[PDB]
Copies of this chain bind each other. A is one copy, B any other.
C-alpha cells in the first residue's frame, strides 16, 4: 500500500482551528496532517505490521531523532493489539541515529542481535531514500529472517533508490513539513501535528 495519498493541491487546515504552541503561530502556514489523523492511520498500520511480521520475534528499530514519535505510537498500537488479541509475539527495540567511508550509525546493540529476527525499520520520512537504503544494507549483512521498512511519510519526489517501503503512513507532495518529531534545525519537534513551515519560520530558525 502507498498509504494515505495527500494530493499535491492539498490545502491543509487553518492554524486557528487547532491547538498549537502559540510560539509557532507565525512560523507555520497550515496544519498539513492533524495529529489525530496520524493516530488513526498508525492504528491500521500496526495491524498491517502484525499481519506481515507477526509470528516471529520482532526487533523494532527506531531511527532517531525524527522517527521517535511515530515509533512510540506505532509500538503502542501494536502493544494494544497484542494484549487484546490471540495472535501475539515478543518484540524488542533498539535506537539508532545517523551521523550528523560514509554515514556513521550511532548506537545500536550488536548487529548479531538482528540475526534470525523479523526486523522493522521505523523512519519519519522517505525523500531521497538514501537513509532507508543505508539502513537496509546495515541490517541485511547480519541475515535477519526478514527486513521491513515503516515510514510515516513518503514524498512524491524523484528517487534513484528502488526499494519501496512496506508500511507507509502518508504519501505527501514535495513540501517541507515539520512536526510530530520532524524538525527544522531542531525546532518544531514538539509540535503534535505535521505542518508546512512558512517562509517566515524557515527564515526565523535558519542555521
Contact = CB atoms under 8 A, between A and B. Distances in A.
A147 interface: no
Contacts of A68: 62, 68, 72, 93, 95
A107 B20 contact: no
Nearest to A43: B19
A107 B97 contact: yes
Interface in A48-106: 62, 64-65, 68-69, 72, 75-76, 78-95, 97, 99, 106
B83 A20 contact: yes
Given A19-B84, A43-B18, A113 B186 contact: yes
Chain copies in complex: 4
A64 to B, nearest CB: 5
Contacts of A176: none
Contacts of A158: none
| Interface of A (DSSP majority class) | mixed
Interface stretch (A137-145, A148-156, A188-196): A188-196
Contact of A18 (B41, B76, B91, B93): B41
B82 A84 contact: no
Contacts of A97: 95, 107
Most interface-central of A35, A65, A88, A190 (chain B CB within 10 A):
A190
A90 B18 contact: no
Contacts of A107: 64, 97, 106-107
A90 B23 contact: yes
Given A93-B189, A95-B95, A82 B3 contact: no
Contacts of A35: 36, 40
A187 interface: yes
Closest 10 pairs (CB-CB, A-B) = A36-B36, A106-B107, A91-B190, A21-B88, A72-B72, A19-B83, A36-B40, A36-B39, A22-B88, A23-B88
